[PDB]
Amino acid sequence: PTLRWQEDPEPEDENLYEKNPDSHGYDKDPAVDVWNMRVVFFFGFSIVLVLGSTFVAYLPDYRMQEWARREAERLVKYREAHGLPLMESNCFDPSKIQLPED
Amino acid sequence: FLPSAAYLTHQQKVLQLYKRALRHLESRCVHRDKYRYFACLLRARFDEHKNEKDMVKATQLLREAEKEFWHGQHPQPYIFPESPGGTSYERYECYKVPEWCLDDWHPSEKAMYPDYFAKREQWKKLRRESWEREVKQLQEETPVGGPRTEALPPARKQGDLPPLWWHIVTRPRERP
Amino acid sequence: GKRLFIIKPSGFYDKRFLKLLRFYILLTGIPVVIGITLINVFIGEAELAEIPEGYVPEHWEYFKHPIS
Amino acid sequence: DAPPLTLEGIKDRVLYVLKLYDKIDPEKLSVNSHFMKDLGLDSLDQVEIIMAMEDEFGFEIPDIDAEKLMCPQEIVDYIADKKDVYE
Amino acid sequence: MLKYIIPTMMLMPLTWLSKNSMIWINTTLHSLLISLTSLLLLNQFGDNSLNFSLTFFSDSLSTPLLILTMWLLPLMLMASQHHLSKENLARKKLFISMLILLQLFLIMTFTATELIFFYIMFEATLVPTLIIITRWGNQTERLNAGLYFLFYTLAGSLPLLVALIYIQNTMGSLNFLILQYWVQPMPNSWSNTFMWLACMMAFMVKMPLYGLHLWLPKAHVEAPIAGSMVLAAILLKLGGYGMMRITLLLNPITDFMAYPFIMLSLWGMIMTSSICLRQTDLKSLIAYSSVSHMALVIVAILIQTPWSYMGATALMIAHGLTSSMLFCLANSNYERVHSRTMILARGLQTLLPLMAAWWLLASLTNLALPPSINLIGELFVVMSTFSWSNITIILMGLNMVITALYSLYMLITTQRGKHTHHINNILPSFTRENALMSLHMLPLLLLSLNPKIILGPLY
Amino acid sequence: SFPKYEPSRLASLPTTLDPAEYDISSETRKAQAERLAIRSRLKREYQLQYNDPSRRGVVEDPALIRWTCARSANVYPNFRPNTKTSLLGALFGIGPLIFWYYVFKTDRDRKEKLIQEGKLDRTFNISY
């Protein structure tokens, strides 16, 4: 014969429909739901996502890319025009180095 | 394992052996006339000692019938293509939309079908009206404190609908 | 009179969401695509000059499409 | 695939496939009938009749119903409970 | 960077002095303006990073993760209703301001010039997430979850500070370039062994690895939705980001000492894919999925190929978006039915009709559907690790097999076969649910169309 | 006419050839009676708590909740670390790791010494 509590039987369950059947996301103030739908589907997509996609679709050449294409064209035309072999090894001058010898 | 009893019975077990043997012999034997011959042969094989009196010798021979049945069954029997364990096996379960739905809508599509929803509304009135006292009094009144059976008696005394009828009557068509 | 009754679950919220999504993407789906069309149909992209003598370049005038 | 059936016609077809069986009479093939009282045949050939209904209508009826059909009207009622043939 | 930080300052008293029924619109609109503001970042090119201030900078190691943070923030705040709408306004404002403060310390962590500043903002990320998950964990062992969480993360993250102070007072200041451009090889001495072990073990706690992986799943299944998403995505990928920062030094001894951690992450990856094949509590399946992905990431980090680093950061961003989505899916199921299990809520093909497409697309992003970022990451990591060893592709492919199996079983277990028809309270799909679906998978598929951004600094 | 159907952990021993059912006991009759009574009482309580029109939420089955709390919470309490349990853990958790660790040391040392010899196909071995 004991109860150990005083409070109400919980959870008293809630149903977001059946009082405002035109409902988007949150609670039953009827105008501000339309304000929410307006602000997220305009100011989240129609000014953010597709516009940022067209922003990042082309932009300055990230990591030197077409710059390196045209520089590769010019330098390979150079090294094939002078007879010397392209991409010579020993990337620094062996006269401009001093080994600690044996 | 069965709803309305605890054991099946001896006659039921003989009948289950007879059904399974008949089904497996169907599945074994094509051309259907040699099958009809072998089925009458099986019927004669059960006619050879149909009139036995020793109960324990009868259930012994039923056991050995299961032995040579399990040795002599069919590999992949002709399951019915409407049956459980089959090619259909709720094939059109795609459109078994449960009927607690169809009212969780917007009143545009409720305005599209007005008469069926008004008639469902009076179905729901007919459910809610005769629900608590009559049905739960017949459930809590007539059986023993341990019910000890799954089957339910109908509303047999005088009046209204049989008890707990909703999710038994209101079901899909099983072929829409 | 031959047809039966069928039970779809709910089409309202589906069609509302998809109608709002296409309408609120195409609300700037038209001016952005037509504007980038007008940029690459009017203004000219670029050409391939070398360095003019005694003239330092800008940090722009490097790019193919001029919105970049 | 699903032709329009009816209760009268399915009673007609079950009547037909009952009457084509050998050792019964076409006299007392009534709705108010038995497979124990008037026709007097045994459990074994009664379940052979049950097998004939499964052969015609193309679906299983269980062993838990094989105890408790025992007459043609309840057979037609249970197949009507299966296929659910109404406008 | 202060152009990003000071509006995140002024957005904090916004939550205080915004009126009733207007906090939502204000926070959402200003958060998406911050999303464009960090979309304005990507000026980095070529030779090096963008080094901006007397102090700060931004790497392309940091660029897509920073964009991921300030794009998760609206999604963070928009998921975080319908379980506190009926609760109080003061606690509501406190929760929103705590999220903004947590994001702020995350962005301070991503703008780390000095590793001491990195460490301070690391555990500054650590501390309020505790408060979020304990005050709104909504299950009976959020207590033990937060307790294990903070104690594991501090106790692993303790000697990293001492190692960083030692590197400070033996090699000059701790700017990343003067820590770079100067660092000498450190040979096989056991001081180097414990220094490597301290740094890498603190981050192994942060990833998590396999031996310390009970740290994670309680802190996901007993946490609120925005806390769980931010915790998972930004903290685990932040730990990987920090290892990518610090591992430039101690490179002669890491081939000597790597072979235990490589083995532990591989065999734990297979065991983790095996353990999340069978369990109930659907929320925990994504948690051990995250453990599998981070073990793959850790194998990719402790091998030292540019291919491996680019595939690693691609897998980081891909699993961040995928886990945020799939956590929102589990939130949808739990807000429908108070179950938290897997076998109770079933069916959902007829009911909630377009939810099926998002469950499918979530399981396909987790499947590594082939043009997606997930398969780019996992494939190039498999390429680099098969270069690193001719025999380790067996564990990678068996990982892929069991990974496909458990993710697709997660699909066909909750949304295939039968509606249980004893539930009869679930409502049709809200616009908010599929709106968050669109917020998740439109940037992921657009970066699938144009993935020239998200690869690492060795692009 | 049959070798009496050896069973398995994989295949099923069917309900027909038990053969211990055919030794019908009165205690098996009482067992089936009480078992059907328990199933009847649980089904009757389920049907009475199911078909109500005011029942908004879920049926709240304590059986599934009991199974989940058995699978997750009540495993670690309680536990007795046995020689069997510790041996099985150390052999199925750490043993495979030390075994594949040995074979990865083996393959790496062979590959490193092989490329140190110079007799590898690294004529072009570009993207490592």
Cα–Cα distances in angstroms (integers) from residue F93 to residues A76, E196, E271, E283, E296, in the given order: 57, 25, 9, 25, 19
The structure tokens listed for F50 are 């199911």
Alpha helical stretches, state H, D1-87: 7-19, 43-57, 63-66, 72-83
Flag if B97 and E421 touch (Cβ within 8 Å): no
Q: Is E181 left (phi over 0), alpha (psi -120 to 50) or beta?
A: left
The structure tokens listed for C57 are 């370049």
Across the E/F interface, how many CB contacts are shorter than 8 Å?
60
Cα–Cα distances in angstroms (integers) from residue F41 to residues B7, B58, E372, F34, F45, in the given order: 18, 36, 54, 10, 6
Residue F56 C-alpha, separation from nearest chain A C-alpha, in angstroms: 8
Helix E306-336 vs helix E373-388: angle between axes, to the nearest 10 degrees?
A: 140
Q: Which helix (H) or strand (E) holds B149?
A: none
Contact status, residue E296 vs residue E378, Cβ threshold 8 Å: yes
* Catalytic choice (D12, D38, D42, D63): D42
The residue ranges of DSSP E strands in D1-87, in sequence order, are: none
Contact status, residue E16 vs residue E424, Cβ threshold 8 Å: no
Q: How far is the C-alpha of E413 from the C-alpha of E343, rounded, in Å?
A: 7
3-class secondary structure, F10: coil
Cα–Cα distances in angstroms (integers) from residue E230 to residues A44, E85, E128, E168, E220, in the given order: 20, 20, 12, 31, 10
Count of helices and strands (H, E) across chain D: 4, 0
> Which of F64, F97, F128 faces E267 most closely, judged by CB atoms?
F97
Contact status, residue A48 vs residue C27, Cβ threshold 8 Å: no
Q: How far is the C-alpha of A58 from the C-alpha of A49, rounded, in Å?
A: 15
Q: How far is the C-alpha of E402 from the C-alpha of E271, rounded, in Å?
A: 10
> Which of A40, A53, A59 faces E435 most closely, judged by CB atoms?
A40
Cα–Cα distances in angstroms (integers) from residue F24 to residues B5, B8, B56, F27, in the given order: 16, 12, 11, 9
Q: What angle do CA B57, B26, D82 make, to 5 degrees?
A: 100
Q: What's the sign of the alpha-carbon dihedral E44, E48, E53, E57?
A: positive
Q: How far is the C-alpha of B119 from the C-alpha of B106, rounded, in Å?
A: 18
Cα–Cα distances in angstroms (integers) from residue B153 to residues B141, B163, B171, in the given order: 12, 8, 21
Q: What is the DSSP letter of E426?
A: P
The structure tokens listed for F7 are 């069973």
Q: How far is the C-alpha of E341 from the C-alpha of A91, rounded, in Å?
A: 63
Flag if E353 and C16 touch (Cβ within 8 Å): no
Q: What's the sign of the alpha-carbon dihedral E232, E310, E436, E285?
A: negative
Residue A43 C-alpha, separation from nearest chain F C-alpha, in angstroms: 37
Count of domains forming chain B:
2
Cα–Cα distances in angstroms (integers) from residue B41 to residues B34, B35, B68, B88, E307, in the given order: 10, 9, 16, 32, 76
Query: B111: Cβ–Cβ under 8 A, 6 or more apart, which residues?
Result: none
Flag if A21 and B106 touch (Cβ within 8 Å): yes
Which of E45, E348, E349, E352 is the best residue to mutate to test the C interface, defined by the most C CB atoms within 10 Å of its own CB? Answer: E352
* Residues pairing with E45 in the sheet: E48
3-class secondary structure, C56: coil
Residues B65 and B35 reside in one and the same domain: yes
Q: Give yes or no for a cis peptide into D62 (omega within 30° of 0).
A: no
The structure tokens listed for E47 are 């030779």
Residue B53 C-alpha, separation from nearest chain F C-alpha, in angstroms: 17
Q: How far is the C-alpha of E278 from the C-alpha of E409, rounded, in Å?
A: 9
The structure tokens listed for F4 are 């009496």
Q: How far is the C-alpha of E300 from the C-alpha of E378, rounded, in Å?
A: 9
Q: Which domain holds residue E231?
A: 1-459
Q: How was this structure determined?
A: cryo-EM
Query: E295: Cβ–Cβ under 8 A, 6 or more apart, which residues?
Result: E207, E209, E210, E265, E266, E268, E269, E272
The structure tokens listed for E115 are 């590793």
Flag if E431 and C10 touch (Cβ within 8 Å): no
Q: Give yes or no for a cis peptide into B153 (omega within 30° of 0).
A: no
Q: How far is the C-alpha of E107 from the C-alpha of E109, rounded, in Å?
A: 5
Query: Torsion over CA of C36, C39, C41 and C46, rounded to 10 degrees?
Result: -120
Which residues in chain C are closer than 8 Å to E430, comparing Cβ atoms?
A: 13
Phi, psi of E48 (to 5 degrees): -155, -170
Contact status, residue A14 vs residue F56, Cβ threshold 8 Å: no
3-class secondary structure, E48: strand
Rg over alpha carbons for chain E, rounded to the nearest Å, is 22
Flag if C28 and A58 touch (Cβ within 8 Å): no
Tokens 């998403």 found at = E229
The structure tokens listed for E143 are 């207590």
Cα–Cα distances in angstroms (integers) from residue E120 to residues E3, E108, E160, E199, in the given order: 21, 9, 11, 15
3-class secondary structure, C25: helix
State the DSSP string of E249-274.
S-TTTHHHH-HHHHHHHHHHHHHHHH
Q: How far is the C-alpha of F6 from the C-alpha of F11, rounded, in Å?
A: 10
Q: CB-based burial of residue F56 (10 Å sphere; 0-12 exposed, 13-18 middle, 19+ buried)?
A: exposed
Give the chain A residue whose CA is nearest to the CA of F56.
A13
How many residues would you count in chain D? 87
The structure tokens listed for F81 are 């670390």
Q: How far is the C-alpha of C45 from the C-alpha of D33, rounded, in Å?
A: 95
Tokens 């009206």 found at = B129
Which residues in chain D are closer than 8 Å to B175, comparing Cβ atoms?
A: 2, 83-84
Contact status, residue B92 vs residue B175, Cβ threshold 8 Å: yes
Other CB atoms within a 10 A radius of the CB of residue B55 amount to 9
Tokens 């990974």 found at = E403
Resolution value (Å, 1 decimal)? 4.4
Q: How far is the C-alpha of F128 from the C-alpha of E85, rounded, in Å?
A: 54
State the DSSP string of B89-121.
SSTTGGG---TT-SSSS-HHHHHHSHHHHHHHH
The structure tokens listed for E166 are 């030692």
Flag if F104 and E343 touch (Cβ within 8 Å): no
* Residues pairing with E48 in the sheet: E45
Q: Which domain holds residue B149?
A: 97-173
Q: What angle do CA E331, E335, E341 make, to 5 degrees?
A: 70
Residues B102 and B169 reside in one and the same domain: yes
Rg over alpha carbons for chain D, rounded to the nearest Å, is 13
Query: E354: Cβ–Cβ under 8 A, 6 or more apart, which residues?
Result: C14, C17, C18, E429, E434
Residue B88 lies in a domain: no
Residue B111 C-alpha, separation from nearest chain A C-alpha, in angstroms: 14
Flag if B3 and D66 touch (Cβ within 8 Å): no
Residue E303's closest CA among E259, E249, E246?
A: E259
Which amino acid is present at E92?
A: K
Query: C63: Cβ–Cβ under 8 A, 6 or more apart, which residues?
Result: A60, A61, C46
Residue B140 touches partner A, C-beta closer than 8 Å: no
The structure tokens listed for A60 are 């300055």
Flag if E438 and C10 touch (Cβ within 8 Å): no
Give the chain D residue whose CA is nearest to the CA of B4.
D64
Phi, psi of F20 (to 5 degrees): -75, -10
CA E413 to chain CA centroid, nearest Å = 26
Cα–Cα distances in angstroms (integers) from residue E248 to residues E122, E136, E304, E385, E408, in the given order: 19, 40, 10, 19, 38
Query: Torsion over CA of E412, E418, E423 and E426, rounded to 10 degrees?
Result: 60
Contact status, residue E12 vs residue E58, Cβ threshold 8 Å: no
The structure tokens listed for E314 are 């691609």
Residue E145's closest CA among E131, E164, E125?
A: E131
Residue B99's closest CA among B166, B164, B161, B162?
A: B166
**In the annotation, is D22 catalytic?**
no
Q: Which helix (H) or strand (E) holds A26?
A: none
Cα–Cα distances in angstroms (integers) from residue E209 to residues D37, E261, E265, F89, in the given order: 78, 9, 6, 19
Q: Give yes or no for a cis peptide into F78 (omega within 30° of 0).
A: yes
Q: A residues 9-28 near F, CB within 8 Å?
A: 13, 15
B→E contacts (Cβ < 8 Å), by residue, are 93-98, 100-101, 104, 167
The structure tokens listed for B81 are 């293509």
Query: E414: Cβ–Cβ under 8 A, 6 or more apart, which residues?
Result: E282, E333, E342, E345, E346, E348, E359
Q: How far is the C-alpha of E210 from the C-alpha of F94, rounded, in Å?
A: 12
Contact status, residue B29 vs residue B174, Cβ threshold 8 Å: no
Tokens 């009547």 found at = D15
Cα–Cα distances in angstroms (integers) from residue E260 to residues D30, F36, F40, in the given order: 86, 58, 59
How many residues would you count in chain E? 459
Contact status, residue B19 vs residue D66, Cβ threshold 8 Å: yes
Residue B5 touches partner F, C-beta closer than 8 Å: yes
Residue A40's closest CA among E320, E27, E163, E349?
A: E27
Count of domains forming chain E:
1
Which of B105, B108, B117, B120 is the best residue to mutate to test the C interface, defined by the most C CB atoms within 10 Å of its own CB? Answer: B105
Other CB atoms within a 10 A radius of the CB of residue D65 amount to 13
Residue B87 lies in a domain: no
Helix E63-79 vs helix E89-110: angle between axes, to the nearest 10 degrees?
A: 170
Q: Which domain holds residue A71?
A: 17-102
Does chain D reach chain F with at least 3 CB pairs under 8 Å? no
Contact status, residue E455 vs residue E306, Cβ threshold 8 Å: no
Flag if E353 and C14 touch (Cβ within 8 Å): yes
> Which of B94, B95, B100 faces E424 most closely, judged by CB atoms?
B100
Chains near B with 3+ CB pairs less than 8 A apart are A, C, D, E, F
Give the chain F residue whose CA is nearest to the CA of B60.
F22
Q: How far is the C-alpha of E102 from the C-alpha of A91, rounded, in Å?
A: 49
The structure tokens listed for E69 are 């943070």
Cα–Cα distances in angstroms (integers) from residue E305 to residues E187, E196, E281, E386, F103, in the given order: 21, 19, 38, 11, 23
Domain stop point among B77, B105, B125: B77
Q: How far is the C-alpha of F72 from the C-alpha of E262, rounded, in Å?
A: 30
The structure tokens listed for D55 are 């052969």
Count of domains forming chain A:
1
The fold for domain D9-83 equals 1.10.1200
Q: CB-based burial of residue A36 (10 Å sphere; 0-12 exposed, 13-18 middle, 19+ buried)?
A: buried
Residue E351 C-alpha, separation from nearest chain C C-alpha, in angstroms: 6
Residue E62's closest CA among E89, E86, E44?
A: E44
Flag if C21 and E429 touch (Cβ within 8 Å): no
Residue F15's closest CA among B66, E314, E230?
A: B66
What is the C-alpha end-to-end distance of chain B, expressed in Å?
32
Q: How far is the C-alpha of E48 from the C-alpha of E180, rounded, in Å?
A: 13
How many residues would you count in chain A? 102
Contact status, residue E236 vs residue E207, Cβ threshold 8 Å: yes
Tokens 């009757």 found at = F44
Residue E217's closest CA among E200, E236, E241?
A: E236
Rg over alpha carbons for chain F, rounded to the nearest Å, is 30
Cα–Cα distances in angstroms (integers) from residue A80 to residues A76, A83, B49, E147, E316, in the given order: 6, 6, 106, 68, 43
